[PDB]
Structure formats: structure tokens, C-alpha cells
């Protein structure tokens, strides 16, 4: 009847109670917080220990979404996946227009939020 350390998470870290003992009461809960790139998903950002030595939670943090970076005059901003954290958008020009600058951008953590890694390109000539 005993669960060890919490599993560490990709999406959230614990709210600092670092003065922690080797295992945790078979009914204890754990207040968490979203990591950079993620926003709070459910009412409950928490882990919990059940009667039989396991850790259990619902994923309470989801990829934050970027702004759409606006029109690309004479080009095409193409969303591969989506516009949320970790996802790439591609730039490409039309007709005779060549593209100058980055051909990709990725929702990266920026400030306390989430922006595009590379600036928009110019679609010119």
C-alpha cells in the first residue's frame, strides 16, 4: 500500500513542495503547474495517490496556440499540423515569386507565451 516519487511529466511540473519525504500517503494529492508551451486544461492541475501505490491524474495541460502570423503577401502560409506549440507552418510563394527568408516557423515558447520561431518571409521578385 505505497507509491514512490511522482512520475515526472512532459507538460507540467510540481508546485514546489520540495521538502518531500521518500514516498507519499496512500491518499495524498499533488498541486501542479503548466510548463512553458502549455496552458491549463482542466479545473484540476493535480496528481493523486490511490489506495494501491500508483500515481493518477488527467492531463491538465495542453499545447498553447500561436497567433496566425497573418497574410503573406504573394505567398501561402501552410499549416502542416495546427498552430499550437511545437507545430510547424511552412511558407511558399506562388507563380514567379521567389521566397526570401525562412521557409518554416514553429510554435516555440516565447516570453510567458508562445510565438513563431522564424519571422515571416517576404514573397517577392
Amino acid at each position: 500500500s505505497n507509491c514512490g516519487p511522482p512520475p515526472t511529466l512532459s507538460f507540467a511540473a510540481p508546485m514546489d513542495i520540495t521538502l518531500t519525504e521518500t514516498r507519499f500517503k496512500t491518499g495524498t494529492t499533488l498541486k501542479y503547474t503548466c510548463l512553458p508551451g502549455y496552458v491549463r486544461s482542466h479545473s484540476t492541475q493535480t496528481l493523486t495517490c490511490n489506495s494501491d501505490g500508483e500515481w493518477v491524474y488527467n492531463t491538465f495541460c495542453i499545447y498553447k496556440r500561436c497567433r496566425h502570423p497573418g497574410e503573406l503577401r504573394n505567398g501561402q502560409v501552410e499549416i502542416k499540423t495546427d498552430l499550437s506549440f511545437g507545430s510547424q507552418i511552412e511558407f511558399s510563394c506562388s507563380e514567379g515569386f521567389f521566397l526570401i527568408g525562412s521557409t518554416t516557423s514553429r510554435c516555440e515558447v516565447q516570453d510567458r507565451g508562445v510565438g513563431w520561431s522564424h519571422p515571416l518571409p517576404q514573397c517577392e521578385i
Binding site: 496552458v39 491549463r40 496556440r65 496566425h68 497574410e71 502560409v77 498552430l83
Partner: peptide, 29 residues
């Protein structure tokens, strides 16, 4: 995706504004 971009971004800004406005509340009991 010229005006749909504008629509999305706006929605986002609201949703973002809603997101934590809601949460800052449920946090604040």
C-alpha cells in the same frame, strides 16, 4: 485565411482572456 486568420487570432485573444480569467477565479476559490 486572410480574414479567417483575423477571426482565429481574435477568438484566440478572447479564449486566452477567458482561459485564465476563468482559472484565476476557480483558483481564487
Amino acid at each position: 485565411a486572410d480574414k479567417l486568420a483575423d477571426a482565429y487570432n481574435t477568438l484566440l485573444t478572447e479564449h486566452e482572456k477567458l482561459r485564465d480569467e476563468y482559472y484565476t477565479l476557480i483558483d481564487a476559490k
